[PDB]
Amino acid sequence: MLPLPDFTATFPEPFPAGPHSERTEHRLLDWLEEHPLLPSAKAKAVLVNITSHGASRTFPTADADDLLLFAELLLWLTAFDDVHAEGNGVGGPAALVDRASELMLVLAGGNPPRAMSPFPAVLHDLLARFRARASAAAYHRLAASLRDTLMALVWEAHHVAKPEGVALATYLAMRPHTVFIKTITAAGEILLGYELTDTQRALAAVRNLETAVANLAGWINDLASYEREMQRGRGQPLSLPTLLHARHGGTIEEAFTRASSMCENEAAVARRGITHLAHASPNALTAHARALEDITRSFIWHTSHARYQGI
Template structure:
């Protein structure tokens, strides 16, 4: 299915980039995961290539900021694999206790007080403490809220699995923005560049629209590249292709084509809206736009190479 994605998806028209410390960050994030007890399958985590994605999304930031993003992505891949492949997300009753413990960690906002008993909690506590130490309360609050949204959305996925339910397209697109955990990754990217758009600018419809489009592009690119792997052991309801097929009654090839077309149309709209913002006279939005653009390109390039989807 990677071959279909390569031929059907338009390549994002943004420059490729990669941080010079990407390989070092990869080893450091693996060591971090190992020391915290997150790793049960190091091969699987290496295939995820979290640092490769982080290094392409943040190609020119300080090494410690790259590590923070790489460690977040490492943690997210571990949670994702635990839910999707190890059975943690098979139903809300099984997942809920783990989510409650992680919400307890988030409620401390990185303040001292213990990281919880599980490796997932200890790692999340470490991420929150390091985010707090960067000295940006606004971004810390945003990060904590976005990770909370991610965890609650995982319960939605678990309920769907338990009831063998395929969500409708509109519902799927909305919740996928949270299960993809792109928002907290964007926030740590803003933090890495020390130049987030002000709160007054971020609530403007134009910036909200560009951010939403970027999140959708990241998630749908992932869906198309991962579709084959996710469906090997049985149908996976949580994929844009699956949602389109179920709602429209399409066969698999038609649904794949429809999902790719949706990505391509959205990429075109994204480029138009970004160009309109770039034509404005506010230089403070430039880092915001560069971060989203880099993430769209990084996801595409990482998806082409990551063994995670093989």
């Protein structure tokens, strides 16, 4: 009974999915057999399913092998967040810092000490396969996005106990890093075989679209996962409706109406940006517009998945 955003004018259903969803879903389960990252087998089944099926919507052009690589990086990242960063209440922020520092050493290169967690070694392998596939600058972009996300997960872990201690503007700036949108995009430039010049990245039209997509991804995730987060023992989660409710007073229903309004407007900005940037002739600016459209559609798709709700 919480009002939700309506994207029928901006991103209507259905969202095209590529062919290799079931193959990816099986190859992911075999991969996770040599490399267990998730305690429960049910947890593994839900996360493998939304990852493979969501990845088919994210990069429908696909290429079963490239899709599996991205699906492996995204599941590794989501599992790391779900295990350590979100966690449950053991070791606190400091344990996540230790786990994030091990990953930073992997990203820096150069034979760090072996870790007891499996996450560093899987990351080492995934970065290796991406380095082979990408341009030097493109791999640097992927590695930077992961470094930035690790700092933002550390930041979040220090504020979940008192969400009301966070200013709304700080949350809006940090949330694109905890929703993984920059890793997904940087992985897309590699796997779709394109790349922007640094002058293109500075274009107002490119920046404004990337911001709107980042905002939309974080905010719909926030709305989609709120009710589930309440059902835990802890209080209100660190997310958009919680901060709007704190800012404006009133009720959670009104916070959701405001948040749903913010999402619809962001979706309209994003649609306009996709349309502007797809008329451009520099060609790299197209494809990028289309990649961001598919990324956005996938994010809207996966809010109906059981990871966020029930039945």
